[PDB]
Structures are given as C-alpha cells and as structure tokens.
Design a protein around this ligand. Structure first.
Ligand code: HEC
Ligand SMILES: C/C=C(C)/C=C/C=C/C(OC)[C@@H](C)[C@H](OC)[C@@H](C)CCc1oc2c(O)c(OC)cc(OC)c2c(=O)c1C
Ligand code: FES
Lengths: 330, 123, 127, 107, 199, 74, 50
C-alpha cells in the first residue's frame, strides 16, 4: 500500500506472481461483472415490484449493499494508484468538501494530509479489505429478510399454492447461469482483460497533472453524469446522492393495487423508457461537456427522478382505474 | 517554501512547480493577456475580482492549480476564455485564473509570496 | 472592450462653471480601478486634474483642489468634472482616463477618452 | 510637486532611424515612470509603464530604460506613424506630473 | 471536441498477434529489441523489464547474459564500506539512459520521455497507435499550423504538437536476420516488442 | 530499400479519391498562404488552418493502406 | 530533529544543531546531485554511511 511501492507491487503481481495476471484480471473484471449483475438484479426487482408489499426491508437492505459495494469498489480502484486512481481518490473525497461548515476538515481528515498522498492510499487499502466483510454481513441480513416471506414470482401474485423445494431444481437451475457467467467472464479475463478498463491507469499517478482523458469507471458514469448536469457545486453532489436514495421512495409512489409489470401496458412501456434513459445517462457521462450533451444530460436527469416521483404514481393510479372501468357494469 | 527562477520563464509560457504537495501555476503573461485580464466587467464573474487584487506584478500570474470544484489540476492554455480548463467537470478559467463557466465556485487561489530579484519565493 | 466618451460645454464664459461628462461602456466605474481627468494646454504641458475611485473617493491636484469637484452616476455609468469659476487660464483640451494600480508597477492610465476641447471666451453660443 | 524635464524638446529625424528622448526628476521616483504617445489628431495612448513594461499594442521596436532620476524612450525605426508627441509621467506620490512633451517631425 | 485535439484515429493494421489463437511473432520481437536498443534506448527507459525475461522469449541465456554485462550496477560496498560497481546480471532490470527526471527533462528541451514498459497498454489503439505514430510524421505540417519551436507535427498525437521528432529512417539499423530495415518494418518490430514488454 | 508504407501512400495518393482529396487540401493551403501576406494576419483571431482537410486525406490513405501494409512486411 | 523542540531545547537551538549537517536535496536543472543544510523535519545523521 505504500504510495511509492503501490503501483509497482501491482505490476509485480502481473509480471512475477504465478498466475498473478489471472488473479488481477479476474478481480478487476469480476468487479465489473459484479455491477452488470447487480444492475440486473436491481432491475428485475424494480420491474416485478419486489420492493413492495412485505419485502420493503429486504429492498432497503439491498439499497445499503448498493451504496457499500460502490464504496468498496472505489476504495479498491485507488489501490493501483494509476492516474485514474489518484484523481478518482481526489475528486471523490472532495465530494465531502461540499458540506457547509466542517467540509474541508472532513476532507483533510480522510486524506490524513494536505492532499492525496501515502496516508490516503494506505488507509484506503486497509478499508478496502474491511468493507467486503461488512457487505458479507449485510448480505446475511438481506437473506434473513428474504427468508421470512420467500421470493416473489413473475405473476406478482402469491406462490403459496404451488411450492417446490430449493434442492434439485433451483440448485441445478442456478448451475446453468453460474457456468454461463463464468464462460463470459473467462472470455474477458483471457481474451480481452483490459477492454472494461481505462488506459490512463497504466500510467503511475501524478499529483501535478490531471489527464485530459479522465473518465470514471463505466459503472459509475450515470451517476457521474447526474452530478455534471447541475452547474452548482453543492446541488451537484446533493442531487447525485439523491439519485441513489430515491430508490427508497418506490414502495410509496407505486400506487398500483397489483404487483409487477407483467400485466401493465403503460408500466412496461415506461419501465424501458427508464432503462434506456439510464443507459443514455451513462453515455452522456462518457461524453464531453459540450453543447448538445449538457442539455441532454439535464433532460435525462429530470426523467430519471421524474420516474419515481411522477410517472409511476400517476401511471399506476390510471391503470388502477383503467383495470376497474374496463369490466365493471354496476 | 519554494524558489522559482523567474528569469528562466519565457513570455507566453506556463510553468508548474510543486509546493507542499499542491501544484503552483506561474505564467509570464503577455501585454495582451494582461489587458484582457484587467478589461473584464465584474458583472460577468460569479466570483468578482480585479486582476490587480490577484497579481502583485501584472507580468506574473501566480496561483494554485487546484480547481475549486472537486480538486483537479486545470489544463494550461485551454478553455473558452484563453486560460485554463478543468477536464474533470468542465470548468473554465481566464488569464487571471478567475472562474467563468462551470461548477467551480471560486477563482483559482492566490497563495502567499514575494519577489527577490529574478526569482519569486512562494510559500 | 472599454470605451470612454467625452461630452459637454465646449465653450464657456468666465466666472461660470466648466462641466464635462465622461461616459464609460464595456466596464463599470464601480467595478474597476481609478477614474482620472487631465487637461492639455496649447503650451504642450499636461496637468493631472484629479480622480475618483471605484469606491467613491476623491484626490485632486493641490492646485485646483478647491474649485473642482468630481462626481459620478453609477446608473448611467459616467463620471464628471466641474471646475468652478473659470478663467482664460483654464482653456485647454480635457481628457478622461482610467488608470490601474498594481503593487509592483504602480499606476498607468491605460484607457483614454476622445478629448473635448473647451474654450473660455466671452463670445456667445446658443445653449 | 516634482517636475520632469523633457529633452530634447520638439526634435526631428528621418524616415527610418533610432531616436532617444529622456525625462529627469527633481526628486527620486524609483522606477514609477510611464510614457504616453499623443497622435496628431488628438488621440492619447499608453506606450510604456513602470520604466520598462510595454502596454498592449505597442510595437516591440519600442524600448525603455533607466532608473532613479534618468529615463529614456528609445525607438528602432520611425517608419512610419511614429510621428507624434511623447510625454512622460511619474506616480510615486500625488499629484502626478508629466513632461514638457517631445514633438517629432519627419524631415 | 475539434478533430485535431482528439488526434487522428489510428487505423487497424493486421498484426500477427491479433487473434484468439495467435501468439506474438517472436522473431519480430527479437528485431524490435535491436531497434529499441540502437534507436529508442537513448531516451526511453524500460524500467519494468528485467533481463531474465528475454531469455527463451527473444534471445538465448548466453545472449542476454552478454547484453547485461555491458552495463554497471551498484554492488554492496567493499570490506571498508566504500561503494563499488559491478557488471550487471540476469536478475537486474534494463537500465534507462537518464539518472533522474531532471537530467531527462534537460536532455529533451523540458519534455519527459515516458518509460516504454507499458505504453502499448497505456494508450488507445495500442499497437496501432504506437505504430501509426512512429510512421505518421509528415514532412510539413498542414497549412496554417503554428508549430511551437522545438515541437514537431504528428497528426495521430492529440493536439498535433509532440515533443518527440521523427527518429525512424530507412536502413538506420542492420537487422541481424537480414530483413530489410525499412522505416515501417522497424516500426512494426519495436511495437511488437513493446507489446510483449507490456503484456 | 524504399519504405513499404511510402510506396503505398504514393500509389493511393494518385487515385480518383486520392487526387480529389489532395486537391481540396491544396485548394485550402493556397487559400491560407494568401491570408498570411494580407494586412495584419498576426492580429486576426480567426486564422484558418487546413488540418480538417489534411485529416480527410490522411484518413483516406489510412483506410487504403492499413489492411495491406503488413503483407509486404516481414 | 523537530522532536527535541519543546522537550530539551528551543526551536532556534534545534534549527541550529540541524543546519550543521548536510542532507541530500533534489538535483538541480541538469540533474546534478547537490547537498543542503539540515532542517527540523530531518533525522539525526549517523556517523557511518553504512
Ligand atoms: C530522444 C531523442 C528520443 C528518441 C530517440 C525516441 N523518443 Fe520517444 N519520446 C521522446 C520524447 C521527448 C517524448 C515525449 C513527447 C511528448 O510530447 O510527450 C517521447 C514520447 C514517446 C511516446 C509516447 C508519446 C505519447 O503518446 O505521449 C512514444 C509512443 C515513443 N516516444 C516511442 C518511441 C520509440 C518506440 C522510439 C524508438 C524507435 C522512440 N520513442 C525514440 C524522445 C525520444
Ligand atoms: C473511505 C470511503 C470514502 C472516503 C468515500 C467513498 C464514497 C463515495 C461514493 O459512493 C459510495 C462514490 C463512489 C460516488 O457515489 C456518489 C460514485 C457514484 C462516484 C461518482 C464519481 O466518480 C468519479 C470517478 O470514479 C473518477 O475517476 C477518475 C473521476 C470523477 O470525476 C473526475 C468521478 C466523479 O466526478 C464522480 C461524481
Ligand atoms: S474539478 Fe474542475 S470541474 Fe470538477
């Protein structure tokens, strides 16, 4: 973790440790897959209304795990101490300098110095090791919360009438995806290890030069984009953090009397509008801060939030009524 | 505390030096840059300041290359104000180092320093 | 950029006041540095009349110090000159200029006005 | 009230050769001395400030030197619009005072 | 962002190592080493590559041992504590041309030659960009390009103004294996060696 | 020996697209050369450059040479 | 050195004891190793180099 040795120890892993590269490429790519899957897992639930009914606490725990995973991930990205590392370390810790009074103090406290230096990278490794074990704990709670009500299902109705044990069905069904998962991760680790990364990170971090090519990790982009879309320093970070916290609102704004999107025409539509919007958001993030893109980023940010706050409640209420009048002849 | 050989620095050039871990910007400004710095209405600055308040000697622009937004080092001779541009979130700085466009809330910082002939002692 | 326009009484009879106005654009009198006035005698001697800062403080030449008065209109963005009790002595061509100040280089009047030539005559003119 | 003494006063020269004007103070002005150029039409520009500093738009062929009480306004080639009146002022203490003026004619 | 700032997009040359089943062409690697040693090594370090790594890759155990013994590294002080040099060995790393960054920046008009050890991975285009750069030097910058003194125009380099000048010219190297050392043949060879160095 | 990338850049500089592209480029250079003599080019803050056109040219040749070049190399 | 300040000696006294020794400094413009007088942030120099 020593700042003068950090980057090189990582190369030592790549160049000298037996299968060291396999270890590194697996960890790095495993990090991206973690998010591709996490996003899917989140989406499925967001679609099938898993955040509803008695499963709220389940969903709320899941939201914490999301915030924690993103944190763990960023702590680890700093450990390579490449250009992206250093500057990611810088910008992100500075996110707290937005806090009104104590601001700068929280920031220099974290750094443990005048700027991102040895103290920063060494405590960051320390913490990158610690959080995973907390996530693990957080997972067992996610499981305990799951276990009292069981999983939902695509129909969005009760599954009490027809149950089948986890063993010899879902143990084997799970195996299929496990393998499929490993097959694609192997394709990246062995044949395209660096496609998901950023080249700037192969250049040792330098405190006097931020590269004109600086771009956040692909899985952070949508959030990066939302922050860039607000021309105020403080509002920029408040809005960004809000974009994550807004997911907690969902069990209260979904006014529908039935669970899931399987039978809702207007919801399925607006769901995909949200999905793609999210991708567009992440795309704007990889772009520059230039004319058509800024405004685009702002329109999309609006949509993102407007989805949980306006669309869903407005749409679901209409669908409730639509479902009613379409068959009531009192 | 750091000593920079000003006699070395040519005219239309920027120089970066390390001071307490943060980079210090020093530009040997041209007469056009100096005029362009002192000929800008405060109404167009979110953080108002005359180039006089910032520089001690109009020929040398000395400051901290730390973007006041989230801490990146702005790129020299870049932007839409012929100054510096922070690649991180798109902030623009003029030849006085004042914040023009972008999230950055304050003009680049002016450190403490004095001259001692053909050299400046920053710190 | 910056512009300074001089306008006003281009001919005045003795025992009266000399009022010249200096309109600025492309910069605010309140924002900047120093706003001076100077006159150019035919004898080719320049005399510094006095100024008014961006704050609102005056500093006049000890000579004219008790006759002149320099004020300003923030709203119209223009500073003035009012030299009371003029004599054939005051005939010269006046200029309004902006002078900066930098700790190390001192002053320097960088932006000048067109230059209005006033004549102190006993002649007549339609007001 | 310090006063500058411009000399040579109202001198002349050819159409492409160096000249040398100069101001002299009664007190000491350090280096606080500027040089202005008054065109034939009546326009008054800034050429040099604080002994050596060139203002924006003034050709590189314009030098300037000295200190204390003796200064100078050099030139490389008066070709062509150099024909004008060149003043000089101090500013170490109020009130500021200019020179006598040095006319320039192309013979 | 203006096309010039981004820099011209390097095309895709058909490298012999591109392909899920293709290995590097070691013969090309060997040639590239020579190009680096005789042309690049005067300004570019290769800090992350120890001698032992060429053995069984591009050269022989004997060959490498020889190349290493052509340089001096510090050994532990003698019996009386006085410093003393020693001829390099396989366990050492390839020595760079400069002792420090200042010496390096001094010898290149303020610029600083990046260590080539991972340049292929540290850039977009990798092999393609590296190669197109070494060859991409026109004899005259396009009309209207104000080029800073001490700078050279290369279209593939972001901003067009690179501090490195063209260094590859025909036959400036005598390839031990006979191959005609044309400027593009040399470019192909170092790049393949640089790719190996990095991966 | 003559460099393989040059030999190819030359053959492709002399094709229809090649000559058209170099023409547009040369018509630009010729337009700039004029501006440079004209009254006060040093002061204009609008100065046109021919990079865009040099890029279209260069790009074209890249597209043509790139998939071919390596067959000629060892 | 600094660790003596306020314990056994004064800020001046330590600065003075420190400056009597030379320590390696960043090489100059052309990369030539040059020395420098000790400072408070330094560690008491030993008598033997190795
Ligand atoms: C000293 C005369 C050099 C020789 C010989 C070679 N290179 Fe070089 N190189 C040098 C400098 C001054 C720089 C920096 C330029 C800048 O503006 O940053 C470089 C840079 C490179 C780079 C990276 C450039 C970039 O993309 O930022 C590459 C890819 C590179 N050099 C490769 C290279 C190779 C392979 C050489 C031998 C054939 C070679 N260089 C020689 C100085 C010098
Ligand atoms: C010990 C733990 C500490 C101190 C703090 C960690 C917690 C913070 C987070 O949430 C967990 C944080 C990761 C954030 O969440 C809002 C992510 C969405 C990241 C958002 C993010 O990333 C960037 C990034 O990666 C970059 O790379 C070079 C560069 C960046 O600009 C140049 C950014 C950036 O501008 C933003 C907003
Ligand atoms: S750090 Fe410069 S804009 Fe965000």
């Amino acid at each position: 973790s020593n700042i003068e040795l950090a980057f090189s120890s990582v190369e030592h892993i790549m160049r000298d440790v037996h299968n060291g590269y396999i270890l590194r490429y697996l960890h790095a790519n495993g990090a991206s897959f973690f998010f591709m899957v996490m996003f899917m897992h989140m989406a499925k639930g967001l679609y099938y209304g898993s955040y509803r009914s008695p499963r709220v606490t389940l969903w709320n725990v899941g939201v914490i795990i999301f915030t924690l995973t993103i944190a763990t991930a960023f702590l680890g990205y700093c450990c390579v101490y490449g250009q992206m590392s250093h500057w990611g370390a810088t910008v992100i810790t500075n996110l707290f300098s937005a806090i009104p009074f104590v601001g700068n103090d929280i920031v220099s406290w974290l750094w443990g110095g005048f700027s991102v230096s040895n103290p920063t990278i060494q405590r960051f490794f320390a913490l990158h090791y610690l959080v995973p074990f907390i996530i693990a704990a957080m997972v067992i709670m996610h499981l305990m919360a799951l276990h009292i009500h069981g999983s939902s299902n695509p129909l969005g109705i009760t599954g009490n009438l027809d149950r089948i044990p986890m063993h010899s069905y879902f143990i084997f069904k799970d195996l299929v995806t496990v393998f499929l998962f490993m097959l694609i991760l192997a394709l990246f680790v062995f044949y395209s290890p660096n496609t998901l990364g950023h080249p700037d990170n192969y250049i040792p971090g330098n405190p006097l030069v931020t590269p004109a090519s600086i771009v956040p990790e692909w899985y952070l982009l949508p959030f990066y984009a939302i922050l860039r879309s607000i021309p105020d320093k403080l509002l920029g970070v408040i809005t960004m953090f809000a974009a994550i916290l807004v997911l907690l609102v969902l069990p209260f704004t979904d006014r529908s009397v039935v669970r899931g999107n399987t039978f809702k025409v207007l919801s399925k539509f607006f769901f995909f509008i949200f999905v793609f919007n999210f991708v567009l958001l992440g795309q704007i993030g990889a772009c520059h801060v230039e004319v058509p893109y800024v405004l685009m980023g702002q329109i999309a940010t609006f949509i993102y939030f407007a989805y949980f706050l306006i669309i869903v409640p407005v749409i679901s209420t209409i669908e409730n009524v639509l479902f009613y009048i379409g068959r009531v002849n009192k | 505390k750091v000593e920079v050989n000003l006699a070395a620095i040519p005219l239309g050039k920027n120089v970066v030096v390390k001071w307490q871990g943060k980079p210090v910007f020093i530009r040997h400004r041209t007469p056009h840059e100096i005029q362009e710095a002192n000929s800008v209405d405060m109404s167009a600055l979110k953080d108002p300041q005359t180039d006089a308040d910032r520089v001690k000697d109009p020929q040398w622009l000395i400051m901290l290359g730390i973007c006041t937004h989230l801490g990146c080092v702005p790129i020299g001779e870049a932007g839409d104000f012929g100054g510096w541009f922070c690649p991180c979130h798109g902030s623009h700085y003029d030849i006085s180092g004042r914040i023009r466009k972008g999230p950055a809330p304050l003009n680049l910082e002016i450190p403490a320093y004095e001259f001692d002939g053909d050299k400046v002692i920053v710190g | 950029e910056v512009k300074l326009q001089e306008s006003g009484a281009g001919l005045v009879q003795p025992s009266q006041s000399l009022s010249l106005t200096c309109s600025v654009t492309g910069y605010s009198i309140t924002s900047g540095y120093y706003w001076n006035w100077i006159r150019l005698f035919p004898g080719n001697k320049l005399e510094w009349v006095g100024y008014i800062s961006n704050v609102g403080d005056n500093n006049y030449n000890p000579s004219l110090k008790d006759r002149l008065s320099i004020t300003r209109d923030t709203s119209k963005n223009q500073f003035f000159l009012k030299l009371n009790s003029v004599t054939t002595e005051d005939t010269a061509t006046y200029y309004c200029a902006r002078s900066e100040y930098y700790s190390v280089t001192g002053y320097a009047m960088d932006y000048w006005g067109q230059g209005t030539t006033v004549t102190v005559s006993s002649a007549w003119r339609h007001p | 009230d310090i006063e500058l003494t411009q000399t040579p006063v109202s001198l002349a020269a050819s159409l492409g050769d160096r000249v040398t004007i100069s101001c002299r103070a009664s007190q000491d002005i350090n280096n606080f001395l500027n040089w202005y150029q008054q065109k034939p039409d009546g326009t008054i520009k800034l050429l040099i400030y604080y002994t050596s500093r060139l203002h924006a738009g003034v050709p590189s062929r314009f030098s300037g030197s000295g200190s204390g009480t003796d200064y100078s306004l050099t030139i490389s080639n008066l070709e062509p619009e150099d024909i004008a009146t060149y003043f000089c002022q101090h500013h170490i203490k109020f009130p500021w005072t200019f020179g006598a003026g040095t006319k320039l004619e192309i013979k | 962002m203006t096309a010039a700032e981004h820099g011209l997009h390097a095309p895709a040359y058909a490298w012999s190592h591109n392909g899920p089943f293709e290995t590097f062409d070691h013969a090309s690697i060997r040639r590239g080493y020579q190009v680096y040693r005789e042309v690049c090594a005067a300004c570019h370090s290769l800090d992350r590559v120890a001698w032992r790594t060429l053995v069984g890759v591009s050269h022989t155990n004997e060959e490498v041992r020889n190349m290493a013994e052509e340089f001096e590294y510090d050994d532990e002080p003698d019996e009386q504590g006085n410093p003393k040099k020693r001829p390099g060995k396989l366990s050492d790393y390839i020595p760079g041309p400069y002792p420090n960054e200042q010496a390096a920046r001094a010898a290149n008009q303020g610029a600083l030659p990046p260590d080539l050890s991972l340049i292929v991975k540290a850039r977009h285009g990798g092999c393609d960009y590296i190669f197109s750069l070494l060859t991409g030097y026109p004899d005259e910058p396009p009309a209207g390009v104000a080029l800073p003194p001490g700078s050279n125009y290369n279209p593939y380099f972001p901003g067009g103004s690179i501090a490195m000048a063209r260094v590859l010219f025909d036959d400036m190297v005598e390839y031990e294996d006979g191959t005609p050392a044309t400027t593009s043949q040399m470019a192909k060879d170092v790049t393949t060696f640089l790719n190996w160095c990095a991966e | 020996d003559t460099d393989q990338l040059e030999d190819l850049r030359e053959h492709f500089k002399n094709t229809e697209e090649g000559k058209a592209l170099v023409h547009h480029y040369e018509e630009c250079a010729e337009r700039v050369k004029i501006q440079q003599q004209q009254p006060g080019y040093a002061d204009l803050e609008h100065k046109e450059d021919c990079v865009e056109e040099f890029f279209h040219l260069q790009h074209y040749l890249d597209t043509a040479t790139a998939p071919r070049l390596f067959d000629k190399l060892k």
